[model samples]
Target: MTLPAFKAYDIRGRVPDELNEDLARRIGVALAAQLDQGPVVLGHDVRLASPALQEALSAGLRASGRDVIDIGLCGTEEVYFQTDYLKAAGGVMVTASHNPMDYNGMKLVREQARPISSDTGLFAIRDTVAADTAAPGEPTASEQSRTDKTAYLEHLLSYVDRSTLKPLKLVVNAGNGGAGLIVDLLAPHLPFEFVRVFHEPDGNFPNGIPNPLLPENRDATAKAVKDNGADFGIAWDGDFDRCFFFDHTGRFIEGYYLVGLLAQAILAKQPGGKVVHDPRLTWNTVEQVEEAGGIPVLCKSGHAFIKEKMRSENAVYGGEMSAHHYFREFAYADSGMIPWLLIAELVSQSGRSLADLVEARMQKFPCSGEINFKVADAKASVARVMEHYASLSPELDYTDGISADFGQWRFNLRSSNTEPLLRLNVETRGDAALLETRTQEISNLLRG
Candidate 1:
């Protein structure tokens, strides 16, 4: 009964064996107990297996003497939208994000859609479910269920200045995920021409896995952009929680670049605004923020933590290397739909390619992107790397991850929040050889 799969930010695992209806029911009851007698918003995605879980979990919530407002099928962010819309005490989303179809999980939020992580109350809920002490009753109750599709669409439009947005042709690839519906709804109203690829919402994902981070999955979007002579390409993951981009020439751009793109854009409008960035990769962001006459605050990665920091600092914008972008005007929640739109707006306003905005940052902070390695002791591996680098004459910092600075070449070594793996991110000043050599050295040391 120990669902060890529940990690720091969310619960994720292979379905049936690891996660089933019974476990979900218990989780619902436990979450309800922890949240007390208050309205809870529930939602799921387009996954084929999600409906049954959503229904069973609702029953469990009712059993705990809590009112349940079901949002039916929607994206992960829609859960946040509904929770805030109803002013609910908590919310639960039945989704596994970009994981394979065999996997499914849940993301929970308390009042105001505040995250419920391991340190918050996830472990307590897990304990209650494991102990088989969940309060039980399929009590009949009446709860209101309304569709926020229109309101959400309107909300999305509110962020853009219609007069300022320009006309441009681009490719949008939903990867046969949850974004198709929302994109279809909003695209009609925008002035730009969008050439869509894999636009249909197909849960089977016949084209491929919806994860744009993987090289193989990016092909369709890249091809669509090139073949159609579009401005650029955009893509989303399975649940539409993250987004990725390609340049006008069909060249893929790293999420780090997009972070800088957004930071520059936001800072231009509000000079001396606050910008937040994850600690894993910071120099380029820090440079951009400083150049824009803004203050940059480095915080821990992950959407939940970044959103909280954005609220506290009143940051105009915050971003992670994972393509999660947050805006203060949007309640500090990361939105997959908004980021790409803002990117297009930036390009239109600047009359520059996506590559132009990011190339300088990439040159100054040449990186190997993110490298993952499975290890028996992730923490120990990180410590090993930190100890190895500590002897050097580099500035050492450990805000969210262990970062070592040699002025020109820097690297961050940290344990994965959701898996038993060590993640390494390295960036250097226009030196590909140094980046490669240092990465190999770290890999060898980490393995040893």
Candidate 2:
């Protein structure tokens, strides 16, 4: 009954040790007791441990006399869609997105799928779980209903203008996770050819973890595109809420460029509308937003912050360098599906390849994507790097990250959100060699 498992944003931990069925049941009961009003939607990803955990959580929800709509074995976005479309009180998705297979977690939201942050009710949920030390009461005998996936499917299709869009060949790498089911269901209806890699929804993840951000995992998706003669390749993480892309030549496109592409496309439809972008990578986004006459608002990184900012600012679209893109039309929730469709629409409308569309922005804002290095002391290392660079550079900005600019080369150094590593991103004008040199210069300082 002592629920020390809940964290600031959502409940997350390694399986068995920190996140067992007992903990899930306790948290579910706490969630039900705290938000005791209406039926709630629940969904889980393809984690091997999910079925047992989900059943326990559902029991806890039922115990509180709350109706549970079990959207079995779905991606994180599908859970959000269910919460929004079904008019439920809230939603919870059992997933550890982009994390290793051994770890599992849950993302909780309030009514209308509004974010549940530390400032808003997440702390209360944690407190409710901790304060209730006694064993939970008897479970209520309530029947659980499965989500109407047909409605979810129809909701996804509604985002794209299928009648006007042209067909193009695509390679989709599910990374051996749950995206394949949704893809398989929708593939027959699409006009384009989709070559699937690791399309099977296997929780074992035989190909390895479903994280596409790692260099090793991206190779397969890139290779599939080149070998199969596809227009582009798309890769999704475990739950498929976010997606990354590769060009026809198997070149890995940076997620920042995708932001620029999406911003331009969205602005074309809603001219002068607001667009929210994370502060991590800003050069190309600012340029594209300016070119498209859309007002760009730079907020702190992370999906919850961006989504909230988007809703408040009435932003038409928002994107992060981490490949998560949010659309206003999609209830301001981040969608892996929207980015690709907008990218496709961008390519189609512009009559250029994805590579060609982003080439100019790449030249203007040359970045090394993101690099992470573990350090014994994150704060100390960051301070050392900041001091070293501040003494050497004339223009230094420490808004969210420490960014030092020399007109020719610039770099941003910040600590990782969830890891004991320093995340570094470098960008430069025209000289790739200078960019590499500056990156190495700071990397050496941090590594030492």
Candidate 3:
């Protein structure tokens, strides 16, 4: 029987029922069998059950005669960093991210931190685990602890000049995840004043799950930013692979604008470098990249796809509307911490508020933030949309999904891989009215 925990990109499932220590051990065994010769790097988030699961994985890996390097209690990107820096064979991070409290998952990577998704060897590992019914073996090798943040922290600081950073009051909301730990570690070197909110690492998630995307969850960070009169606010998901932003006015900025803002920031240093972006939002990124003296490359939206594209193109940087930012210097892996530091440096050097930095681009490319619909028949709804839009003779693209450009405006229709939902995004060339109208029109069509 096939395991339900395995997905196209990663493994995520409800605990005990769908995933447990036993399954974690199996996955570790399968992973060790699949990778090239070398030690394996492992890390886990602040989940209540994460350590036990990690221990089981260590057992399996050691049983297969492979040494395990345990980077205790860390963020997902740390695994990626250590995997590459230590020259390990592979790495696995135990984190469910923003999923429900009962859920736990893992993100896998090969040497040099290359993603091992379905197309690579994830499914084969899944198959091996599913078919294994042999008696459990004792750990033949040993494990070692190598928790050092100096190198990782140094790399994060390399993205910005510490001397240029202003003493701006910044609001930092960890949402009770592990992000606060890293922030505290970097506090001594930076010149900014940090106002901490939900600043502790608590697996119980007393405030809420570490997802600031929800309107209910975002109020804390935005309110803190305004109340403290801070320069801006930053928040992260459970594992801190994805980060969210709030302007000084307590406005939650749509991630689409940050793409251009960051692309401009990166291109200033690495002129004429390539910046990869997703298809969900296009015009603004393409415009900003070109104006910044950089090439804009489009790729399918997802970490695995983005990392692969970034490596292949040797791109300097990449950003998704979903808030996953990739850097070439960081083994082509996404980091939630680097983006904010870079933005802070940009703010310091330009002497412009974050709101002012993004306002013109937001106006020039009005976009409807990603809207989701849990419809009865997603396939039928898509066909109806295609049939209606076909008559308009719009320029169509099937890059990630169906992206139809109508000269003045454009919208993309795609299905979620993990959920039964239809995702939509609409944008216009400096026309807010057209953006609103088309977004609502598409919403109606999707709902009905």
lDDT of each: 0.83, 0.81, 0.92
| Better-scoring candidate (TM-score), 1 or 3 | 3
TM-score of each: 0.95, 0.94, 0.99
Ranking by TM-score: 3, 1, 2
Report per-prediction Cα RMSD to one decimal.
1.9, 2.2, 0.8
Which prediction has the highest TM-score against the true structure?
A: 3
Ten residues in sequence with the least summed lDDT for candidate 1: 134-143
Off by over 4 Å in 3: none
For candidate 2, write residues 164-205 as lDDT tens digits: 566888999999888888878887767778999999988888
Q: Which pairs clash inside model 1?
A: none
Superposition TM-score, candidate 3 onto the true structure: 0.99
User: Poorest 10 consecutive residues of model 3 by lDDT?
Assistant: 414-423
